[PDB]
Amino acid sequence: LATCYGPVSADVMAKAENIRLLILDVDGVLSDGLIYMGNNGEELKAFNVRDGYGIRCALTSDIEVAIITGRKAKLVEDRCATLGITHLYQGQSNKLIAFSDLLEKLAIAPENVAYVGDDLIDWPVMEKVGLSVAVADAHPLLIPRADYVTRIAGGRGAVREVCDLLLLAQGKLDEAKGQSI
Amino acid sequence: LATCYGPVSADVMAKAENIRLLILDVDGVLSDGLIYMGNNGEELKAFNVRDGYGIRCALTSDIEVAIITGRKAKLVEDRCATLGITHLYQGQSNKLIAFSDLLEKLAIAPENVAYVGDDLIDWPVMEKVGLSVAVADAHPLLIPRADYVTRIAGGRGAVREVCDLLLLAQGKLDEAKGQSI
Amino acid sequence: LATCYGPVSADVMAKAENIRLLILDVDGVLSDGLIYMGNNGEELKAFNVRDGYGIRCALTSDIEVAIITGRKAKLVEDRCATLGITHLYQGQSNKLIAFSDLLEKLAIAPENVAYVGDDLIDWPVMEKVGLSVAVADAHPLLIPRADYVTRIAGGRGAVREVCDLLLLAQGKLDEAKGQSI
Amino acid sequence: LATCYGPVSADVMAKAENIRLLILDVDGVLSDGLIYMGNNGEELKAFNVRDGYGIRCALTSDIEVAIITGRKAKLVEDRCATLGITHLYQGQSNKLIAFSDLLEKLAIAPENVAYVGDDLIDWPVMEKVGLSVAVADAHPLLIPRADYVTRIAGGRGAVREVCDLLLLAQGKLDEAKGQSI
Amino acid sequence: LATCYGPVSADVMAKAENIRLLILDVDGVLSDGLIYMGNNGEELKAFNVRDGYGIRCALTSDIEVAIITGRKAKLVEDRCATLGITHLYQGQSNKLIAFSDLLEKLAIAPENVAYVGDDLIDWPVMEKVGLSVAVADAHPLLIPRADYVTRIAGGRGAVREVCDLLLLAQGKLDEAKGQSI
Amino acid sequence: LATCYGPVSADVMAKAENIRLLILDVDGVLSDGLIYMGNNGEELKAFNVRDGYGIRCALTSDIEVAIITGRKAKLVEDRCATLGITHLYQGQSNKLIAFSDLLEKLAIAPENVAYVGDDLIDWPVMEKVGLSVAVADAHPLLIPRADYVTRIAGGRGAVREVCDLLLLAQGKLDEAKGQSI
Amino acid sequence: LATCYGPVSADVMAKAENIRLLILDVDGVLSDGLIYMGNNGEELKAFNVRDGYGIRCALTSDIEVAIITGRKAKLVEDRCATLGITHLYQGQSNKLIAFSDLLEKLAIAPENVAYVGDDLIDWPVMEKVGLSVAVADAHPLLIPRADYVTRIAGGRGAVREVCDLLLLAQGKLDEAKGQSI
Amino acid sequence: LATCYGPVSADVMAKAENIRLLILDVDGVLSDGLIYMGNNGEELKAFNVRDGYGIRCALTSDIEVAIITGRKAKLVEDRCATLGITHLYQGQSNKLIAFSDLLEKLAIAPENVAYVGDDLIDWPVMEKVGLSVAVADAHPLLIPRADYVTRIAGGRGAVREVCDLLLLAQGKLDEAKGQSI
């Protein structure tokens, strides 16, 4: 029940034991929600190396990592490459289209999927997964709907927390090896 | 009287019920008030996807959104274009001019207007609107003057908070549809 | 979904709608867990008027308030008499005997019962009730087990928080009349 | 506008200028809302010396102090005698009667009166007074209704804060004299 | 390594593994350091129920509890009797004599003893014991000397945390039974 | 320049060097400002043991401890007797008479005197003494006037902090001895 | 004595009354101390619009603004030109040289100058000016040396706070106008 | 025993006294763990001037500074050039290889080495050094393993804190010189 972020329920741990796919949102989850825009059309976004370390640990521990986001940017493709993420969907408002696509591509059951969100747009997908997750500073209306609420804020180590939770539940946390990138 | 951010007065809710136009300042409201500057003259500014979802909800729920700011940047024009904001005024030191222009263009009364500010130069317009809003971390002197002080700080989701307030007051929050962009 | 303490899940509200009996612990729930002891043999315990107002509200709005505690003190009886709590259990280490006694004396189903606890000794009862409640500053291992976690600490208005929640779910908050005692 | 606890609005300062009578609730205002009960019938309530200083200042700066509380206790009469409070009403569920009694006894208009409450039961009186005040930790549903919300919690200096505001607004803060008792 | 109060080092767990005797100070550890005094000579002190729960768990799980304190009060004997603590040393300025006697009476080595302190007077004993513990709000000069620093402050559940640590280290946590008294 | 409570100025350290007398207020300084009153006439006040330890270290290091308070209570006389304090001035609204009485009976210079206050009744004395100290939670208008401001609040170890400052400045901190009473 | 950031002493207000020149460090004062660096040699620094408004108020209200920094960047020249600052000294590791040059060029006494620093490299200049200022999050060793310590952190509104303090002291605060740039 | 960040153990101070080489991780230690990425393949990272100052102090006080990181970026090389760091290892999966290379290059024993890490990838090296340090916001599992945990978070001044600690232990802090760069 107890973790390094605090105690979690026996139900949350049992759901986490069956997770084979980890779907993430970008803005608000892998970042604090900020979009950096410039005068010459530059777009910047901050990622956390702690979350990078976690994604590497999960991908090398038989847990697939996928991303479905509403925005479309070349930088997100570059971040997926650096971490080895091959399943990526950008410009997706109705995220169930991309969700149905992953279940058909990876032949995976919805109960074996985990989703980490931060806004109300994430819920239609969170409602169908085995382990719905909302970040600490997710929109107040999403927090009570998720199976688990992270202690660490979005883009501060929230994805890492979930990665550590999935690894601990499946008995891989200590054995896990990753790159803090 | 109850919201997802905390209790509000009936006065504030009744004010928000009549709002047809939401005017926003940029620096300190849509951002955390930070101006990122570069050696080759590059300028950057950070926006929140949470605010964007709120603005996207507002514009689809028959509430116009406008922006008045003292500075001028192409990046602001891009952010407005991303969100579908068609009413934008930049390089404005007297904001009452643009305020009167919006009243004439929309055939609207000052009471149907809400204004979110963060500094003393916002007050001349806030004094005249139906709902004056100061952000959590606004200038200490502006805070006591506004009808509503937000819980969330500028650039962290304060606009979304205001958007959610206007939608709840008009019974639109439940079926509100936007994009986290 | 919206309350004055923060947003709650639909499942917590649905559970609260069918609550006809509320059971409360004393130490750490009605008080802050402190036991004032004296040289001549005095004993003191602090209660909250805010909790008193809520307890009065529930009892006048068709919700029975009962108390099960592990310590025995005359002061508890006086507080029960002031608020109108006619069902009291003191000096009870095994709380399962007192719980099954309340169900038989009032002909009530376990799903129509809500319990507010603060320690591991409270869990046996909390497992079988319809709405299990843990206070904000409850024991770390008890927090994730409960259906709902209060925002307000024990002896600071946590009982009031539950009372307000039950009244809001049953649509009795606007008509609720109590005394600040 | 600026005070030593933080800035106040020009409207609140204007409301505090007319005040001749200051009515104070006990539980949650002069105390932190705690009721200390014993096994022989002992009842204790914590008062703040800092609040006592401000009360002695108001009574010497041509401002009358009154107390209306829903509970009856001898300790309250003892505190009133220590601070020189002549007007006292206890065991009052319908506080409008004690409020109407003060208006006729002192030949004072409702706009010249100020109340400091903490719970919903205080509101019917707070509606009719010239300056309605709620403490920093007053019930969530009362806070947005008051004209002024104090920075200091109940029984921590919240009365003193109100007292300091009335003295400053009437230009008597510097020449104010009181005893820290 | 991970507990419900947060992670601890492998060395702390191994030091807590051997503990057969837990010694606690009264003021600042079992209380928040406050001494309530009266005009007629009444002396009062606050104790925490969850501390009592942990002590009840400790005594039942083959771990002796002793108390050495500098003050003398009848209420301390009353508290020790309620929880079943037989070893009590009141009016002890020099806390070395009581420590030397407890080693002789219980026939125990210094590495199987754990002391929880809060001030500089507690150090001479803590220097010799196998597990020296300082409470969260101990004197700033004692904190960096102890083997483990609690997260919970004295009189708020600090003793419980220590008890829960020893029980988990000895593997008795799941089957530990106590009373919230 | 550096203490265990944080860095202090050289001027404050030099002022604390010549200190031979330490005058303390009772309410807001030795206590947190709370006065407990019963229906029978019982009065209670809390004192911190760590605060007592510092006072004991001061008296046994050629630093006299005096007490001037606006309130009059029997319990304070008992507290002075326990801590070995011989100087007491209770029921003093005009503290300039009591301060003049200390410079005459101990034959001491104002610059060798340190005062620890909490309210505006303490400044008339503090203005003339060598080291004027305000507690962390002193009245907002007193804080800026003092030479030094404590990190710890009144009744939680504020006096101890002042005592530690005086002893280290006089180089007696390492050799100091007291009891946690 | 009263400001919108909290109470200040009569001595600090007297110092701020005579200020004609405000000297500011860049990193840690006008920014939060961060230096953004890129692979192609890009360099960014963040500034606050609230600080901008304050500087614009000072310059138009007969208070010259100067900058002395140990680093050198083109972006700083661009920021000064936007704010209308004509006195800029970059790459100065001995800030005494640029200090004496300002006193000669503007014909001004040291007591009529204010300095806002964040690290120990700022002290040699701060030691000689009429009003030395350390920011809220300045280096712990610098803080207790300054005449005034700001409530706001560097690059968050600390400069605005000082600007407001000088304007309030000189009776220019109300009449002063600026731009949120 | 006392620093400007708070008290430390004599053991930590003794370990810090021996240090001749300081090895730092970049991400989460010199920065706050954020990787800024753009659509044109730009990469930005934030460094603290306060850390830069302390690094300049270390290198001019006979304490070498080295950097080992799992990522590889040109900006880091530029940052090292600004601060005079000559020992830099990038793209380092196995940090023990770089650790072995450093000790063989500089003829230095592990006991004379300090390492400041933030994640589990740093522990293998930290296990061998004389002073292992974890930043205030390091991964929860790393914190209790280190000899010293900093008060300041990564990229906010945690590296400066370590530099200050080494200099104080070696009696160099008072006369150490650096540049805010």
UniProtKB/Swiss-Prot annotation, chains A, B, C, D, E, F, G, H:
Reactions that this protein is recorded to catalyse: 3-deoxy-alpha-D-manno-2-octulosonate-8-phosphate + H2O = 3-deoxy-alpha-D-manno-oct-2-ulosonate + phosphate
UniProt name for this protein: 3-deoxy-D-manno-octulosonate 8-phosphate phosphatase KdsC
Enzyme Commission number(s): 3.1.3.45
GO terms for biological process, alphabetical: lipopolysaccharide biosynthetic process
Pfam families: Hydrolase_3 (PF08282)
Assembly description: Homotetramer.
Binding residue positions for substrate: D27, N48, V49, R50, D51, G52, R56, R71, R79, K95
Record family assignment: Belongs to the KdsC family.
Name of the gene: kdsC
